[PDB]
C-alpha cells in the first residue's frame, strides 16, 4: 500500500531447508498463527512460520517496484492462478475455508505482497528487486548458452505453461530429433512438440536437456553428475524451450514459491472467520490472527481430515501446538478460575452460608448440566463442528474453556466476571399476567423514582412467583431469601449498578425492560459482583476487596477508595476490622511473624489488615471459609504457572502436576517452614494433634487467602510460585 503497509517474516520450511520471505499487508491482523501444509497437489508438506516486525513505510515510486516483483511470481506461480494475491484467496473453494459453513464476505479483503530476504534478520532492499527485474529481463534460453554449471538449476518452460523443471544435465545421448515410444509409437521430440503444442521447433539439432518437473521431485534429493538416483520420472525437453531463471531463483525460493497461494489463502481465511464468527463467539479482546486461532481452537473441536484443519492447511499455536492441545488446556484452566470466581462471589452474595452449602451452591453453577444449558443458549452447539470418530468430551467443556480463553487474552480476569456475571444470571431462566400494583412499581423501579417498598413489593411478588435469574433452581431459591434480608434502601444502588453493568457489556440499554424478570436480574448482577464480604462464624465482617489492588481500574463498576455505593460498604468493613480491639497474645505474635515471612513483596501498609486476618487464619473454629478461598485460589493460581511453564503440555500432565503439589500433606510441610511460632500456636490452639494432620494443610491454605485479601492476586500468587510451584513433581 502507500504508507499503511505492515511487515511479517514469513518463513516457508521444507525437507530440503527454510526460505525466508518479508510478507506485506495493509492490515493489521496482529500476530498470523503458523500452518503446516499437507503432502501436496505436487508439492511436498511444507511448514510455515510467522513473525510481526516493523511498520514498514513505503513511497507510491516504491510501492510500484514491488509490484513488479508481485508480477514476476505471478508468472512463475502459473497460468492457473490469478495474477492477484487477492483474488487467489478470494477464490478458494469453501471446503478450503476453517468453517465451510460459515462463508461471509468481508467488506475488505487483505492486501499483501510477498519480498524474499536472505535471512529473517536481513533488511528489505528494493534496489535488489529491480535487479532480479532486469536478470529475468534478460535471461536467456537454453540454446544461446556446462552440465555441472547448471545442475541443479531452475529453469521454465514459458511455451507451455510456463512448467518449472530442475535441470540435471545434458543428455548428449540424444537431441530433439530422436525418437521416443510410447507403447505401440515412435514419435520425434521435434514432431511431437509441433503436433501437441504447434510448436515448430528451429535448433533442432541440439542435444536434449535432463530435467525433472518441479510437481515430480516431490521432496526427493537431487542426484550427483548422475551416478541418476529416481529416474522414472525424468524428462528431456530442446533447449529452445527451456527459459534459465536467474541465479536468485534457486531450488528452495521456487518451491516455497509454491506455497505463497496458501498463504495468501491462510489470510483471506483469517478475515473470513474473524467477520463471520466474532460477533457470535464470547469475546477474548484478541484480534486478527489470534482471534481465528481462538475461535478455531474454540469451535473445530475435532482434528482435520487427512489433508488438514481447513484446505491442505492446519493451524497451529506458539511453540508448535494444536488447536485441539489448546482446547485441552484452556478448559482445563478455565475450570479453574471459574471455580475461583465462584467461589468469591457466593462467598459474598451469601454472607451468612456454611463452608457445607457455599460447596453445595457451587457445584450447582459448576455442575455439567448446569454449563451444558449455558452452552445452548450461547448457541455454540450450532457453530461447533466435528467428525464424530473425534467421546468424553462435552458440550459443557466449552464454556470452561471459553473462560480459560478470556482469561487469557488481553481482557484479564475482568473479561471473566464478566463473561459469568452475563451468562450465570439472565432474565432467560425463568418462565412467564401480572397483577396491576406490580406493574406500577416496576415502571418506577426504572424511571428511578423507586423507592423501599416498591422493591420490597416486587422482591415478594418473584419470591412467590418462583422466578429464577440463576441456572439454578436451587441458587435462585436461595437468592430470593438472600433478597429479603437485604435493607430495601440498599436494594435501588444494587440495581443501578446491575443495570450499569448491563449497559456496559452491551446486553441492554440504558434503561431496564420494566419486568419482574429483569429487575429480579439486575438486582442479582449487582450483588453477584459488589457484595462486599462474607461473615466468618463463631468475629467480624471480612471485607472482600482483591479487586481494588488490580492495577488495571474500573470506576464505572466498582468505583475508587477515596467513595461510590458499593466501595463505600467495602471500605466500611475494612475500617472496621482495623478498630477491631487486638487481644493480640500469642496469635497476634503468630500473625507477625507469618506477615514478615512471606518471602514475597507486598503492597504498602497493607500489613496492619493483613495481620488481622493472619489471626483469623490461625484461630481453630473460624479458618474455614478462608481455607475454603485459599484452597480455591490455588488450583487456579497454580493451573496459571503451569499453564504458562509448560506451554505443550496437555490436559493430563498438567492435572497430574499441580495435584501433586496441592495435597494436604504436602501444604501441611510448607506450614512447618514458617518459624517454628507458628506451629507452635498451631498446636496451642489443637491440643494433641500430630504432624500428618489435616489441620496445618488447612491453615495454609487459609493463609494463602488472608495473604489474597489482604494484599491482592498478584502478592498471592507470586506466594504460590515461590513456595508451592517448587513442590510439583515432574510426570517424568
Ligand atoms: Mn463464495
Ligand atoms: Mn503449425
Ligand atoms: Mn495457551
Ligand atoms: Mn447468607
Ligand atoms: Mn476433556
Ligand atoms: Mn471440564
Ligand atoms: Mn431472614
Ligand atoms: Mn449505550
Ligand atoms: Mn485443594
Ligand atoms: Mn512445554
Ligand atoms: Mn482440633
Ligand atoms: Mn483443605
Not at 499483501?112 to 528494493?126: C, E, G, Q, W
Not at 511455451?159 to 509409437?185: C, H, K, M, P
Not at 440498599?490 to 448491563?502: E, H, K, V
Not at 513483596?601 to 489488615?609: A, E, N, V
Request: aromatic share 8%.
Amino acid at each position: 500500500g502507500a504508507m499503511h503497509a505492515l511487515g511479517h517474516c514469513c518463513t516457508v520450511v521444507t525437507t530440503r531447508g527454510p526460505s525466508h520471505w518479508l510478507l506485506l499487508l495493509d492490515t493489521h491482523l496482529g500476530t498470523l498463527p503458523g500452518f503446516k501444509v499437507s503432502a501436496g497437489r505436487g508439492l511436498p508438506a511444507a511448514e510455515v512460520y510467522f513473525e510481526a516486525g516493523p511498520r514498514v513505510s513505503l513511497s507510491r515510486t516504491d510501492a510500484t517496484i514491488v509490484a513488479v516483483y508481485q508480477s514476476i511470481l505471478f508468472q512463475l506461480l502459473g497460468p492457473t492462478f490469478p495474477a492477484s494475491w487477492t483474488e487467489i484467496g478470494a477464490t478458494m473453494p469453501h471446503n478450503e475455508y476453517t468453517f465451510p459453513r460459515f462463508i461471509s464476505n468481508p467488506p475488505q479483503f487483505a492486501t499483501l505482497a510477498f519480498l524474499p530476504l536472505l535471512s529473517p534478520t536481513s533488511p528489505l532492499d528494493l534496489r535488489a528487486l529491480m535487479v532480479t527485474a532486469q536478470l529475468m529481463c534478460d535471461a536467456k534460453r537454453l540454446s544461446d548458452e556446462l552440465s555441472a554449471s547448471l545442475h541443479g538449476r531452475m529453469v521454465a518452460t514459458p511455451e507451455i505453461s510456463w512448467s518449472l523443471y530442475v535441470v540435471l544435465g545434458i543428455d548428449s545421448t540424444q537431441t530433439s530429433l530422436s525418437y521416443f515410444t510410447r507403447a505401440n509409437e515412435s514419435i520425434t521430440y521435434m514432431r511431437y512438440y509441433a503436433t501437441a503444442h504447434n510448436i515448430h521447433l528451429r535448433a533442432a539439432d541440439l542435444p536434449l536437456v535432463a530435467a525433472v518437473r518441479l510437481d515430480d521431485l516431490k521432496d526427493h534429493q537431487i542426484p550427483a553428475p548422475g551416478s541418476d538416483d529416481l529416474a522414472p520420472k525424468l524428462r528431456f525437453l530442446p533447449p529452445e524451450l527451456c527459459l534459465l531463471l536467474p541465479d536468485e531463483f534457486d531450488l528452495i525460493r521456487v518451491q516455497a514459491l509454491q506455497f505463497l497461494p496458501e498463504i495468501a489463502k491462510h489470510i483471506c481465511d483469517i478475515q473470513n472467520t474473524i467477520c463471520a464468527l466474532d460477533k457470535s463467539f464470547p469475546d477474548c479482546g484478541r484480534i486478527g490472527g489470534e482471534r481465528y486461532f481462538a475461535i478455531t481452537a474454540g469451535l473445530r473441536l475435532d482434528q482435520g481430515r487427512g489433508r488438514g484443519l481447513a484446505g491442505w492447511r492446519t493451524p497451529f499455536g506458539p511453540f508448535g501446538v494444536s488447536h485441539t492441545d489448546v482446547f485441552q488446556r484452556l478448559e482445563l484452566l478455565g475450570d479453574a478460575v471459574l471455580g475461583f470466581i465462584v467461589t468469591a462471589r457466593l462467598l459474598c452474595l451469601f454472607p451468612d452460608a456454611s463452608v457445607g452449602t457455599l460447596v453445595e451452591l457451587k457445584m450447582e453453577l459448576v455442575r455439567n448440566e448446569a454449563l451444558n444449558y449455558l452452552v445452548q443458549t450461547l448457541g455454540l452447539p450450532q457453530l461447533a463442528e466435528f467428525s464424530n470418530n473425534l467421546k468424553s468430551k462435552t458440550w459443557a467443556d466449552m464454556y470452561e474453556e471459553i473462560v480459560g480463553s478470556i482469561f487469557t487474552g488481553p481482557n484479564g480476569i475482568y473479561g471473566c466476571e464478566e463473561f459469568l456475571a452475563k451468562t450465570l444470571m439472565s432474565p432467560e431462566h425463568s418462565k412467564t399476567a401480572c397483577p396491576d400494583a406490580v406493574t406500577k412499581a416496576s415502571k418506577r423501579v426504572c424511571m428511578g423514582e423507586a423507592g423501599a417498598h416498591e422493591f420490597r413489593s416486587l422482591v415478594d411478588y418473584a419470591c412467590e412467583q418462583g422466578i429464577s435469574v440463576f441456572c439454578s433452581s436451587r441458587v435462585s431459591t436461595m437468592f430470593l431469601e438472600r433478597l429479603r434480608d437485604i435493607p430495601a434502601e440498599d436494594m435501588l444502588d444494587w440495581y443501578r449498578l446491575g443495570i450499569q453493568f448491563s449497559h456496559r457489556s452491551g446486553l441492554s440499554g440504558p434503561g431496564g425492560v420494566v419486568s419482574v424478570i429483569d429487575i429480579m436480574t439486575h438486582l442479582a448482577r449487582g450483588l453477584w459482583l459488589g457484595s462486599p464480604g462474607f461473615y466468618v462464624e463463631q468475629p467480624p465482617t471480612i471485607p472482600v476487596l482483591y479487586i481494588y489492588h488490580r492495577s488495571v481500574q474500573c470506576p464505572v463498576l466498582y468505583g475508587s477508595l477515596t467513595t461510590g455505593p458499593v466501595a463505600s460498604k467495602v471500605l466500611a468493613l475494612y475500617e472496621k476490622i482495623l478498630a477491631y480491639e487486638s487481644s493480640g497474645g500469642s496469635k497476634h505474635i503468630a500473625a507477625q511473624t507469618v506477615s514478615r515471612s512471606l518471602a514475597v513483596p507486598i503492597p504498602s501498609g497493607t500489613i496492619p489488615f493483613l495481620i488481622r486476618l493472619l489471626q483469623i487464619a490461625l484461630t481453630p473454629h473460624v479458618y474455614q471459609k478462608l481455607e475454603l478461598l485459599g484452597d480455591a485460589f490455588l488450583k487456579c493460581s497454580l493451573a496459571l504457572h503451569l499453564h504458562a511453564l509448560h506451554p505443550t503440555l496437555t490436559e493430563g500432565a498438567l492435572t497430574r502436576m499441580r495435584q501433586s503439589a496441592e495435597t494436604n500433606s504436602v501444604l501441611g510441610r510448607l506450614t512447618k517452614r514458617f518459624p517454628s511460632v507458628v506451629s507452635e500456636v498451631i498446636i496451642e490452639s489443637h491440643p494433641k494433634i500430630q504432624p500428618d494432620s489435616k489441620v496445618y494443610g488447612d491453615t495454609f491454605e487459609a493463609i494463602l487467602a488472608a495473604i489474597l485479601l489482604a494484599c491482592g492476586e498478584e502478592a498471592a500468587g507470586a506466594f504460590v510460585r515461590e513456595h508451592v510451584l517448587p513442590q510439583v513433581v515432574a510426570d517424568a
